Amino acid sequence: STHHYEQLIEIFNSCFADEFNTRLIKGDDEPIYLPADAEVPYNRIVFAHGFYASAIHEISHWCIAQFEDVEVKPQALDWLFCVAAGYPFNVSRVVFQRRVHAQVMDYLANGIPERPARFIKALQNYYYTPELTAEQFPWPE
Ligand SMILES: [Co+2]
């Protein structure tokens, strides 16, 4: 499959534009969260640059809502999303990515929270990818 940020906009909106009144928007240099208002009546997650990886990262952060500690769970969702989509994962070293790996394992063993779980299933149906298995997430070596 190809991977274009425009695809993530449609997948995200399909998952969340109704239930959570939230949509994904390609922005400029800044990631932003803009709540619905009287003119634009839906919440907007704005990601920086027309870059697939950047959209994934803002989606992960939205799902979760000392920099290492705060970044572990969003980067774990990043990794899950990328494998679900058939996209290559990188962080943005080995010690930190092992913390992310453990958190992916935690999620897979103990349960993925509702919003990322929904996004993962939609990714799988959009890109026709097999069910996730821990084996698709190699320990950082
Ligand atoms: Co981040």
Residue numbers in the entry: 3 to 67, 93 to 119, 131 to 179
Paper excerpt:
A recent study revealed that the β-lysylated Lys34 of EF-P is subsequently hydroxylated at C4(γ) or C5(δ) by YfcM. Although YfcM is structurally different from any other hydroxylation enzymes reported so far, YfcM shares similarity with the ribonuclease YbeY, despite their low sequence homology. Furthermore, the three-histidine motif of YbeY for the coordination of a metal ion is replaced with a putative 2-His-1-carboxylate motif for the coordination of an Fe(II) in YfcM. The structure consists of five α-helices (α1–α5) and a β sheet composed of three β strands (β1–β3).
In order to confirm that an Fe(II) ion is coordinated by the putative 2-His-1-carboxylate motif of YfcM, we prepared crystals of Co(II)-bound YfcM and calculated the anomalous difference Fourier map, using the data set collected at the peak wavelength of the Co K-shell absorption edge (1.6049 Å). The Co(II) ion has an ionic radius similar to that of an Fe(II) ion and can adopt the geometry of an octahedral complex together with six ligands, similar to an Fe(II) ion. Therefore, a Co(II) ion often binds to the 2-His-1-carboxylate motif in a manner that mimics an Fe(II) ion. Furthermore, a Co(II) ion occupies an Fe(II) ion-coordinating site more stably than an Fe(II) ion, because an Fe(II) ion is easily air-oxidized to an Fe(III) ion, thus changing its ionic radius. The resultant electron density map clearly exhibited a strong Co(II) peak at the metal-coordinating site, indicating that a Co(II) ion can be coordinated by His59, His63 and Glu98. In this structure, six atoms participate in the Co(II) ion coordination (nitrogen atoms (NEs) of His59 and His63, two oxygen atoms (OEs) of Glu98 and two oxygen atoms of two water molecules; distances from the Co(II) ion are summarized in Supplementary Table S5), which may mimic the Fe(II) ion coordination. Therefore, our data suggested that His59, His63 and Glu98 of YfcM form the putative 2-His-1-carboxylate motif for the coordination of an Fe(II) ion, as in the active sites of non-heme iron enzymes. Our atomic absorption spectrometry and X-ray crystallographic analyses confirmed the interaction of an Fe ion with YfcM, and the binding of a Co(II) ion to the putative 2-His-1-carboxylate motif of YfcM in a manner mimicking an Fe(II) ion.
